Amino acid sequence: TNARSRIKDTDFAAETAALSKNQVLQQAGTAILAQANQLPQAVLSLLR
Amino acid sequence: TNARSRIKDTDFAAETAALSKNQVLQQAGTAILAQANQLPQAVLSLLR
Numbered sequence: 001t002n003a004r005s006r007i008k009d010t011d012f013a014a015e016t017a018a019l020s021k022n023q024v025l026q027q028a029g030t031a032i033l034a035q036a037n038q039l040p041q042a043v044l045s046l047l048r
Numbered sequence: 049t050n051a052r053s054r055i056k057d058t059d060f061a062a063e064t065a066a067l068s069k070n071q072v073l074q075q076a077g078t079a080i081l082a083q084a085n086q087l088p089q090a091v092l093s094l095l096r
Contacts, residue, residue: 047064 043061047061
């Protein structure tokens with residue numbers, strides 16, 4: 001049984017950190033996109 | 049896709065300048081013509 005856990009039993013005290021990292025990335029790349037999609041808007045609004 | 053834009057995606061931030069130049073030429077050569085077509089008028093109005 002102890003083996004069965006060493007196989008399966010996630011050391012989620014580490015995977016929590018991994019988890020935050022993923023949540024974090026979702027957030028960050030999103031905000032980057034909210035910024036990114038403003039670029040072409042500016043380009044044309046000005047050249048016009 | 050990025051290639052597809054490097055092929056197609058006009059760097060219209062330059063073509064705007066080209067655009068103005070063309071509009072500009074339309075205007076200028078036109079005014080030149082408004083002047084040019086006054087020449088023969090003057091020629092005869094005076095020699096008569």
